[model samples]
Target: ELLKPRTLADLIRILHELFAGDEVNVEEVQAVLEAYESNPAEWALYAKFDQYRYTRNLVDQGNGKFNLMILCWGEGHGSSIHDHTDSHCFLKLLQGNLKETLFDWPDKKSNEMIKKSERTLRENQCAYINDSIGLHRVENVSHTEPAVSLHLFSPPFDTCHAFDQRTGHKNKVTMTFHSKFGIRTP
Candidate 1:
């Protein structure tokens, strides 16, 4: 029988088993993520948002295999077109609505990114992407309310690249955590 996870701990245990082999089935992993919804009481602490930038709250750090986080997006908050390095990303929107736009890089030397597709995720909706799919950007569509999402990354990445649309400049970014479990000060 497939593992049915109710809590984050159980979810982590199941993910470890799913990604144990050389070949990782992203679809299966995403299915598991979709099946489980985070408990509000548990995630209440890390669901804080910043007006300027999205806040990433570290939920679980894998043993060189994956990492889990909660991302809080404030009004008009979003990310630039970014690459996940070698990690596969699975996202589940826990609150509000999010618009995700995918992009394609036609030329390696050029900064221009061709728009591929777009998806809007509401509460309980999920999305997945990998290196093979190219680049994309995510944003909270609401102008007044904030959004919250849960993200899972396999083989967690330390450094990734963010692309600038107007300037067409790609820069390396080091990921950091805003809070561990409850809250973040300073």
Candidate 2:
């Protein structure tokens, strides 16, 4: 099957509504999730051949909340363990299979940075995150087709903590902005 191209205008509209005010609620989030799940605009970011492909749909909700992104992944591609400092988030998988590994900050007295709690999400699932258990990462577990998802954030995902799996080093870094996608909509 042929893939559908992204509709940037539609993405911008969604972001406009989301950041419109502090009144955002679950219903609003659900509406967006459903739209993406339906593949209304038929974004074909994964048509390319690669380990994985991810696209973002962002919105600039003027009142301190801004940022929405859509990620599409090819088979076997995954993201690293990361966390939003104090942001709230909603993730909905639209196509293919995804494995979400969630983690929590360890006890204050412990020397550990963040502790892995469990794998909270699988394919065709949705989850929420706030200050508690705020750290996690998602990846595509599929070996055949492709995986895709939509991400919504309040105040937008400006920066996050990225962990170095090999060196065990934790670094605070800004989200990658120089991409075809990954910015809040106007």
Candidate 3:
């Protein structure tokens, strides 16, 4: 039987099994991600929140295969436009609504980006994007409550560039986690 993940632990196990092959089956992995939903109790450990910027809470390092994380976003908090560095990314809203703005790849000479598309992802909705699909910025659309999202990055990346449309500059930043394996970092 194809069992659905009931907890974060279950999800990790399934993902490990899926990526056991020499090549990651992107199609199968995404299918599982899209079909899964988050449980409050299951994620409460790493569901730590803050009022500043959005937080990336790592649940599993994926043994170098991928990264499993829970991203918590406070009111009006958003990310700078950024690229995925060619890695595959899947994000599913665990709570509230998030607005995602996709931008065209930066201009070769000026490094400026043009807004391409925008959309709102509600609870349980999954979205996928890669550098090839262009860059994107995500923000919590609600002014009241915080939003939460589950993220999966295959062949996890450590560094990526944040694009500035006005300055035409792309700043490279290292990814940091608010919590790693349910433990907060300074």
Candidate 4:
């Protein structure tokens, strides 16, 4: 029988076992997705999260398959227009509400900028992201609450393509702290 992860070590062991072959398969991906779906209340897993702000926890699956990241979103925090250069990913909101805007590539070089194109997730919302239809950013617009989400990337997450609406410049950059997590305290 497949064991359910009840502790951090359990999760690590399961992930390590799944990644021992260095490839992500359907079963492996399904296992991870199920875990995130089942354990939304793992407070220990969110130890670094700032209740007053946003934070992120990234776990390497130790394979060429995927990486998992948990993001904490605070009020009024959001991300810029961006695209993942590699891997199809998914996001599941564990707490609060989040807004996402999807943009389409007008050319090989530029994506047509749009506003509030689609809203897939509200509170406790989950969505899938794939390369075929990939390119969007998420934000926390709530004035009275916070948001927490988990990101799962297939074939692992390395870099992303970011676009500035004001500058209209496309550049490849590493995902920064502020980009992954929404909240920061002084």
Top candidate on lDDT is 3
Model 4 segments beyond 4 Å from truth? 1-41, 47-54, 60-64, 108-112, 166-168, 177-186
Report lDDT per candidate: 0.82, 0.58, 0.85, 0.63
Per-residue CA lDDT of model 2 for 133-175, tens digit only, reads 5566677776786776666676566778776544445678876
Models ranked on TM-score: 3, 1, 4, 2
For every model shown, what is its TM-score relative to the native structure? 0.89, 0.67, 0.93, 0.69
Q: Could you give candidate 4's per-residue lDDT for residues 1-186 as a string of tens digits?
A: 357666534665676676567455645444554564434546334525555555666644545456667777778877767877656666767677888888665355544465537785864455766657857878888988777776767667667877776544678877644332222322
Where's the lowest-lDDT run of ten residues in candidate 2?
177-186
**Candidate 4 clash pair list:** 54-183, 65-155
What pairs collide in candidate 3?
Answer: none
- The lDDT, on a scale of 0 to 1, for candidate 2 is 0.58
lDDT of 1 at 124: 74
Best by TM-score: 3
**lDDT value, residue 93 of candidate 1:** 84
Tens-digit per-residue lDDT, 25-77, candidate 1: 87788888887775777678779777689989987776667788899999889
- Model 2: residues with Cα > 4 Å off, grouped in runs: 1-15, 26-28, 45-64, 108-124, 164-169, 181-186
Q: Report lDDT (Cα) of residue 169, candidate 1.
A: 73
